[PDB]
Amino acid sequence: ASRVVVNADRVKGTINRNIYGHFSEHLGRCIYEGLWVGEDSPIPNTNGIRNDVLEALKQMKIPVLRWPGGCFADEYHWKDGVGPREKRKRMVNTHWGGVIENNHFGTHEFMMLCELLGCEPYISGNVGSGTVQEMSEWVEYITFDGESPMANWRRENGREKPWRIKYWGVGNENWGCGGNMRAEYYADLYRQFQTYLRNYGDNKLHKIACGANTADYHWTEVLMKQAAPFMHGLSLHYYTVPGPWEKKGPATGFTTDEWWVTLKKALFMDRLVTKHSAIMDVYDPDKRIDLIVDEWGTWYDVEPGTNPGFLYQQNSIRDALVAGATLHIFHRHCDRVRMANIAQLVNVLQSVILTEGERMLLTPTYHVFNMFKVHQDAELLDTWESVERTGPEGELPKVSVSASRAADGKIHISLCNLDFETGASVDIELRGLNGGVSATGTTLTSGRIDGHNTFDEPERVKPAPFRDFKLEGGHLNASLPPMSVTVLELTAG
């Protein structure tokens, strides 16, 4: 059996709720259909935003939402998305391309969306093809409470008081689709652009520089050395891609080898975060600057017959394990990692929700985020572990565990069983308690390694009560089901 000691009297730090963040680009059906249906749609909606998705996201407690993209963000000109909705600029592609952009979802609709969800807005400004004045005016338009062309324009468009916004990305993927820049060159632009993004009134900007793709450590070094004093966060992007880029592999009907490879590549996040943080420590030993993993998740070949440019893929129990295992990695690094944004809220990459017209489903990834919401802003508890191995040559840990205490005093222990073939025995020793506790549990598992939900069968994979454990005198012995994510809630008394 795997062994775990939880020291409940020993706090290691706070798991920032923004670790549970999300990301929605104007791509495929993420914004259009996925969220924005329009005020006059037969799909029930609140001010143009579909109610089914809204309610599901609120239950999940989405903490922050990044918009309007990765690549799209450094092509976007924000002024195209404000003003009388029916008169905004429109781009239509008469090709398989499928680029229909009417700009009906713009700045006002996005701030409204965040207010509806109860989440923080995180806007990504355009460095690659934008100008310093353009970005500066966006911030002024949003946050200025005085009189000016930009602030007056906001009021004319229906928002009288300024909005608050903390999170502001100064360019996305600038090493690539955001301008193919050298780190050294981006650093100069970053420093210039951020200069003109002001704190108006009571607003305080949290400026986020574009960080490394995967293992580009030189990027991190240059950005930290050249630009650390001018930023509050630095990002990092890492997608879990089973096969080569040219043939990533399918979301369902995959082999057992693809299972192990996917999970092994997911766990590589720990090395990336560790090594990028080590470079950050050299220039910022006090850890002032946030590490922000604002693109992560699985990336497969699209579902057969669909437009590859739309990035639509299914979502299985394998993705649930990627999500749960990666979230645990962020927890362990919560002294530096303070936000993450899984790539793509709806209908795009590793989504929590898929839709098909009026129909929608919750993916197994959704269920992980909903179950793990108990970790948002929780205190991470000191845990020691000795876990068995699984997979070819024991290349994976069989189990991944994390323990935290919520503000109301309840303790939550989440556990992933990475082995699809057998259950996992975990012996959990609870120390530093002071009293006694009782426990309940919930588990997400499947009978098939590619177990997933569809529109006709939307509840094939979903959480269920978990009762296969024994709690006796400060020892919790659990028998986790195969391929599962489980959460145990412990209540004092």
Side-chain angles (χ1 to χ4, degrees):
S2 299
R3 187 164 178 274
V4 181
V5 178
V6 179
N7 294 291
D9 59 331
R10 184 66 181 182
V11 175
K12 299 295 269 184
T14 296
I15 303 165
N16 196 301
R17 62 181 179 267
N18 292 336
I19 284 176
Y20 286 80
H22 292 270
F23 158 44
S24 61
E25 179 173 11
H26 291 231
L27 184 157
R29 294 175 302 126
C30 192
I31 296 290
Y32 304 101
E33 191 198 313
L35 284 157
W36 183 264
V37 298
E39 219 201 336
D40 293 321
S41 165
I43 300 173
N45 67 86
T46 294
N47 307 342
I49 295 169
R50 52 191 302 155
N51 290 341
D52 52 9
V53 178
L54 226 175
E55 279 316 306
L57 299 180
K58 282 158 72 189
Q59 172 170 333
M60 185 188 71
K61 293 173 177 200
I62 178 169
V64 64
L65 180 56
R66 178 182 186 235
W67 169 87
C71 298
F72 184 78
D74 289 69
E75 297 166 19
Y76 188 53
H77 301 287
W78 70 270
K79 290 178 185 181
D80 293 349
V82 303
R85 196 179 281 141
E86 71 285 336
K87 310 289 193 189
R88 298 184 192 155
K89 300 188 192 66
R90 177 175 190 210
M91 180 178 242
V92 192
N93 201 308
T94 43
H95 277 6
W96 186 219
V99 184
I100 301 76
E101 182 59 68
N102 61 21
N103 283 117
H104 283 191
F105 192 87
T107 295
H108 286 245
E109 293 77 24
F110 178 66
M111 300 306 275
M112 184 190 67
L113 174 62
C114 296
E115 287 151 359
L116 284 168
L117 293 172
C119 68
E120 292 282 345
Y122 168 10
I123 290 176
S124 203
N126 180 350
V127 163
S129 69
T131 66
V132 171
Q133 176 171 9
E134 177 184 21
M135 194 178 299
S136 171
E137 281 180 332
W138 203 357
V139 169
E140 188 190 337
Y141 181 97
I142 294 165
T143 63
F144 187 46
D145 61 351
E147 299 164 30
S148 74
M150 288 308 98
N152 296 355
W153 193 17
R154 185 196 64 238
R155 298 197 182 88
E156 294 167 11
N157 292 327
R159 173 64 191 201
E160 196 60 46
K161 291 181 166 180
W163 286 290
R164 298 292 294 271
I165 178 164
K166 303 184 288 182
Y167 311 109
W168 197 281
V170 185
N172 163 263
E173 304 184 54
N174 299 99
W175 29 261
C177 62
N180 289 292
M181 302 183 180
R182 294 186 306 119
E184 291 82 357
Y185 179 54
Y186 173 72
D188 286 330
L189 295 190
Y190 172 81
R191 292 167 59 156
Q192 175 182 15
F193 271 84
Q194 67 79 38
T195 297
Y196 294 93
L197 308 184
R198 308 304 182 171
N199 288 347
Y200 294 110
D202 286 321
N203 198 243
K204 305 280 183 297
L205 280 187
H206 193 94
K207 290 153 174 185
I208 297 167
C210 175
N213 175 24
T214 312
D216 187 355
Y217 302 119
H218 175 71
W219 188 277
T220 303
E221 165 176 307
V222 171
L223 266 293
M224 293 298 294
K225 195 171 183 65
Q226 301 304 321
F230 310 102
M231 72 183 69
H232 208 341
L234 181 69
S235 69
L236 169 67
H237 290 191
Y238 174 61
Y239 287 101
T240 298
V241 185
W245 193 262
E246 299 67 28
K247 193 181 188 159
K248 305 178 177 63
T252 62
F254 49 84
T255 64
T256 68
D257 273 345
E258 290 176 301
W259 174 273
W260 300 122
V261 171
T262 299
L263 297 191
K264 186 71 182 173
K265 285 184 172 182
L267 289 189
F268 184 63
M269 177 74 77
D270 188 38
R271 183 177 143 315
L272 288 181
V273 170
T274 297
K275 296 192 178 186
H276 285 287
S277 294
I279 291 159
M280 297 173 78
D281 293 343
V282 169
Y283 302 92
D284 176 31
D286 297 330
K287 311 184 178 160
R288 182 182 66 78
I289 296 163
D290 303 356
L291 178 55
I292 295 167
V293 187
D294 62 1
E295 299 182 26
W296 71 275
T298 56
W299 192 328
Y300 305 127
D301 297 323
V302 300
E303 292 312 292
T306 69
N307 186 346
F310 275 33
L311 303 192
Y312 186 84
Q313 62 193 37
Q314 261 291 348
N315 199 291
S316 75
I317 193 73
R318 179 182 52 169
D319 301 285
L321 279 137
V322 170
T326 306
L327 293 163
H328 282 187
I329 286 161
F330 297 152
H331 293 188
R332 305 203 179 94
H333 294 272
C334 72
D335 58 309
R336 167 78 73 177
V337 170
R338 297 171 187 143
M339 176 181 298
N341 307 84
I342 189 172
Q344 312 217 42
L345 192 64
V346 192
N347 297 326
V348 171
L349 295 176
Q350 190 177 354
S351 301
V352 289
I353 290 172
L354 306 177
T355 65
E356 189 186 55
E358 66 173 6
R359 306 160 92 196
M360 80 158 204
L361 60 81
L362 305 170
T363 64
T365 300
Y366 176 90
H367 295 305
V368 176
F369 273 82
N370 199 30
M371 293 170 73
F372 278 30
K373 75 189 165 199
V374 298
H375 293 302
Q376 293 188 20
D377 284 332
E379 292 179 314
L380 181 69
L381 299 173
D382 176 73
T383 71
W384 311 320
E385 62 205 28
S386 179
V387 314
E388 50 181 322
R389 309 301 301 173
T390 196
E393 308 200 329
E395 65 173 357
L396 297 174
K398 180 154 197 186
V399 163
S400 173
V401 186
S402 185
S404 63
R405 183 178 49 244
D408 67 2
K410 295 186 200 173
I411 291 170
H412 301 90
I413 310 184
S414 49
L415 315 92
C416 305
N417 178 6
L418 283 71
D419 186 7
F420 65 83
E421 268 169 337
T422 68
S425 300
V426 188
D427 172 33
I428 303 163
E429 170 175 309
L430 315 162
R431 298 185 185 168
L433 220 44
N434 282 191
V437 296
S438 61
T440 61
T442 170
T443 191
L444 180 74
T445 186
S446 183
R448 295 293 191 276
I449 65 173
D450 70 347
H452 62 283
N453 291 326
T454 61
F455 301 104
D456 292 341
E457 300 192 67
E459 294 185 15
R460 216 145 62 182
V461 179
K462 65 168 178 166
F466 176 68
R467 315 192 204 265
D468 203 341
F469 66 89
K470 165 80 169 174
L471 175 52
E472 184 211 308
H475 271 280
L476 203 167
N477 295 294
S479 303
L480 306 172
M483 44 176 150
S484 64
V485 178
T486 305
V487 182
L488 300 171
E489 175 171 76
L490 321 191
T491 307

